Amino acid sequence: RATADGDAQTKLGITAVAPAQAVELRPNFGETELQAVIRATYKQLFGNTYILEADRVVQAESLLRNGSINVREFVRLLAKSELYKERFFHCTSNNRFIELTFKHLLGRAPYNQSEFVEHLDRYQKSGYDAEIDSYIDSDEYRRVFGENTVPYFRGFKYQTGQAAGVFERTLKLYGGDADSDTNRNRQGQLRQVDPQELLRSGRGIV
Amino acid sequence: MNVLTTSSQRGGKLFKVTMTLSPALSHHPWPSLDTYEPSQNSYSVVVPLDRLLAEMTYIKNKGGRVLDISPADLEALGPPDISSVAIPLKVELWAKADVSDVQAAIVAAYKQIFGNTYVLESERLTSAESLLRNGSISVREFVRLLAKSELYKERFFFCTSNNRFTELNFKHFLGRAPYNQSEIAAHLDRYQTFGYDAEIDSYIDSDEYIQAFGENVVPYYRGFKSQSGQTVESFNRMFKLYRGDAGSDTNLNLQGQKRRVDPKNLLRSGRGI
Ligand SMILES: *[C@H](C)[C@H]1/C(=C/c2[nH]c(/C=C3N=C(/C=C4\NC(=O)C(CC)=C4C)C(C)=C\3CCC(=O)O)c(CCC(=O)O)c2C)NC(=O)[C@@H]1C
Numbered sequence: 115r116a117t118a119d120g121d122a123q124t125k126l127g128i129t130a131v132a133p134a135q136a137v138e139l140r141p142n143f144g145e146t147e148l149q150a151v152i153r154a155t156y157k158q159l160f161g162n163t164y165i166l167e168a169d170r171v172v173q174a175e176s177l178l179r180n181g182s183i184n185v186r187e188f189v190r191l192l193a194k195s196e197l198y199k200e201r202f203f204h205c206t207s208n209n210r211f212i213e214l215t216f217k218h219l220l221g222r223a224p225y226n227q228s229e230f231v232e233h234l235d236r237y238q239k240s241g242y243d244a245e246i247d248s249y250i251d252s253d254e255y256r257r258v259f260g261e262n263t264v265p266y267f268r269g270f271k272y273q274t275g276q277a278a279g280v281f282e283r284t285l286k287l288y289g290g291d292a293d294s295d296t297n298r299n300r301q302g303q304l305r306q307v308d309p310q311e312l313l314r315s316g317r318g319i320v
Numbered sequence: 321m322n323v324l325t326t327s328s329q330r331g332g333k334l335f336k337v338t339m340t341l342s343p344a345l346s347h348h349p350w351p352s353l354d355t356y357e358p359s360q361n362s363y364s365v366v367v368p369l370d371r372l373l374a375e376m377t378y379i380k381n382k383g384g385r386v387l388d389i390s391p392a393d394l395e396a397l398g399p400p401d402i403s404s405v406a407i408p409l410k411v412e413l414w415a416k417a418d419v420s421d422v423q424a425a426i427v428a429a430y431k432q433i434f435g436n437t438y439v440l441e442s443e444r445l446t447s448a449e450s451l452l453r454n455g456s457i458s459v460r461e462f463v464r465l466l467a468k469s470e471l472y473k474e475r476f477f478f479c480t481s482n483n484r485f486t487e488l489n490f491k492h493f494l495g496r497a498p499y500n501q502s503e504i505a506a507h508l509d510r511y512q513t514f515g516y517d518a519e520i521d522s523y524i525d526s527d528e529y530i531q532a533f534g535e536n537v538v539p540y541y542r543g544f545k546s547q548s549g550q551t552v553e554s555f556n557r558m559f560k561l562y563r564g565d566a567g568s569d570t571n572l573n574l575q576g577q578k579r580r581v582d583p584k585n586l587l588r589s590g591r592g593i
């Protein structure tokens with residue numbers, strides 16, 4: 115065979131995301147650490163889509179500089195924002211949005227069909243906002259990258275209690291270092307994850 | 321820490337929660353055992369009212385435990401003005417004092433000796449007032465009678481612990497706050513053997529008293545302005561002991577009698593013995 119170590123990753127194009135590097139903000143931060151964290155958040159939340167100079171949110175970044183909010187709060191502010199909502203929420207369908215937010219706020223794709231039920235009903239019962247919170251609030255977000263750590267892709271590496279067929283699902287969502295999910299491409303914003311593969315993982319009643 | 325906004329963009333009273341962090345709650349992304357960062361052993365977040373319940377439960381379900389919660393309006397308030405205590409004012413009782421001048425010393429003595437605490441007409445002490453104004457008692461002796469009175473023991477000494485009663489005494493009888501654990505320890509011991517009366521005497525008897533506001537001057541706030549043999553921390557302590565005007569020492573409030581000056585702060589200024 116004589117495949118390299120890297121080979122299997124480089125063939126898929128997941129070489130950067132696979133064991134992704136984790137960026138942490140520290141108790142007192144240099145001017146560069148701040149600006150790294152900020153760049154990493156923006157790249158991960160918005161899905162490597164391009165954020166102009168006007169799109170940036172100055173206040174959230176200031177509060178992050180004073181120390182008045184942690185990184186986890188910064189993430190919520192970005193996620194609960196016109197700019198995010200315009201790209202991944204108002205143009206797509208709720209089925210499409212859920213899989214996006216899952217990927218953005220936790221590097222995996224959705225593990226099974228029930229994950230769509232708890233998050234769609236949540237959205238009708240309460241806001242968008244309460245939904246978004248349920249993600250950052252959830253224990254899996256807290257357990258990994260709980261505070262002061264930028265969210266990073268957890269997909270493409272074995273995680274405990276993973277479902278099988280994340281690996282493939284996230285490959286549908288990631289699709290390479292130059293790809294980016296974009297509200298504004300021809301044929302709009304559409305789900306990549308096909309709905310029949312979800313059911314392939316269990317589907318209980320409700 | 322300072323909170324920068326009192327309310328969330330969506331209407332909602334922000335509360336500042338303080339917790340002892342735990343490795344589960346936040347951990348460095350390193351190999352090896354998970355550690356939180358040392359400088360954040362006591363972490364603080366500001367949460368809206370809505371997320372407060374869930375946030376607190378998560379903290380507790382992990383190893384965390386909540387040191388305290390406080391409304392962000394109260395927090396993120398000015399440190400108390402020191403205008404009135406920067407220059408105390410000072411009252412002298414002359415010999416051959418007018419009826420009025422004696423009155424004004426009595427009031428001042430209650431105010432300082434009892435903290436902004438209110439004293440009702442039934443609480444007030446005719447007998448000791450009677451002694452002042454026909455002579456026979458000094459201002460210093462009147463003060464010693466107040467700190468012997470039950471009213472004084474009921475508030476400051478019978479509800480709280482001796483460790484708090486000590487600083488509470490240091491404030492009433494000397495403007496200063498306490499400086500170094502040594503002082504707190506000595507008073508605790510003196511109280512055990514001599515008993516409550518001796519302890520009270522030892523402030524009024526001590527050299528700082530008499531050297532300042534010796535006799536016939538109602539005691540006034542010395543702290544808040546630089547004193548001899550006074551560690552700097554002591555000046556910050558004074559800001560904990562003294563909150564505003566129309567802030568008191570009250571047994572009456574919920575968990576009324578706690579310690580303004582955390583014991584670790586005392587140990588900073590001087591640890592030994
Ligand atoms: C310029 C020479 C020509 C041009 C380019 C062009 N690109 C876009 C939009 C995007 N370009 C990219 C590409 C990248 N993302 C990356 O990280 C990298 C390097 C790793 C690249 C090269 C992406 C992701 C977008 C989307 C950005 C976003 O959604 O904000 C456009 C704009 C098209 C649009 O409708 O957004 C253009 C114009 N096209 C030309 O006409 C030039 C000849």
Ligand SMILES: *[C@H](C)[C@H]1/C(=C/c2[nH]c(/C=C3N=C(/C=C4\NC(=O)C(CC)=C4C)C(C)=C\3CCC(=O)O)c(CCC(=O)O)c2C)NC(=O)[C@@H]1C
Binds near residue numbers: 123271272
């Ligand atoms: C061992 C008997 C054989 C072998 C195994 C092997 N696996 C990988 C890499 C991965 N294995 C998995 C598999 C899982 N993901 C899941 O969700 C589950 C249970 C549902 C499994 C079992 C995954 C996700 C990876 C990739 C990410 C990771 O490393 O965790 C390798 C390494 C290949 C690579 O380049 O990553 C190997 C060698 N292969 C053999 O040679 C044995 C016959």
Ligand SMILES: *[C@H](C)[C@H]1/C(=C/c2[nH]c(/C=C3N=C(/C=C4\NC(=O)C(CC)=C4C)C(C)=C\3CCC(=O)O)c(CCC(=O)O)c2C)NC(=O)[C@@H]1C
Binds near residue numbers: 354356358
């Ligand atoms: C070993 C020489 C002595 C000792 C050490 C000891 N430490 C703990 C627990 C913690 N120690 C730390 C230390 C750090 N955390 C950091 O991030 C850093 C560098 C930035 C340091 C130096 C921390 C924070 C903890 C608590 C949480 C954690 O696990 O990280 C223990 C165990 C305490 C316990 O009861 O859990 C011990 C034993 N103590 C000894 O016995 C030696 C004298």
Ligand SMILES: *[C@H](C)[C@H]1/C(=C/c2[nH]c(/C=C3N=C(/C=C4\NC(=O)C(CC)=C4C)C(C)=C\3CCC(=O)O)c(CCC(=O)O)c2C)NC(=O)[C@@H]1C
Binds near residue numbers: 484505508
């Ligand atoms: C003996 C069973 C154990 C022990 C006791 C111990 N205590 C100290 C020192 C102090 N203890 C106190 C505590 C109090 N403050 C109060 O207001 C009251 C009454 C309600 C108490 C009991 C204080 C203030 C001190 C400081 C100094 C002093 O003597 O007052 C020590 C001395 C150690 C030190 O000062 O650092 C000791 C030994 N500790 C043990 O080892 C025993 C198991």
Ligand SMILES: *[C@H](C)[C@H]1/C(=C/c2[nH]c(/C=C3N=C(/C=C4\NC(=O)C(CC)=C4C)C(C)=C\3CCC(=O)O)c(CCC(=O)O)c2C)NC(=O)[C@@H]1C
Binds near residue numbers: 437567573
């Ligand atoms: C009356 C409108 C409402 C009310 C008031 C109330 N206050 C207390 C107790 C205190 N009130 C104060 C007030 C001040 N201290 C000051 O020095 C100043 C300005 C200089 C003010 C206005 C203070 C110091 C106390 C504590 C000492 C004391 O014994 O009063 C109470 C009693 C609290 C208790 O539990 O004992 C009350 C009832 N409460 C109401 O019912 C009205 C709405």
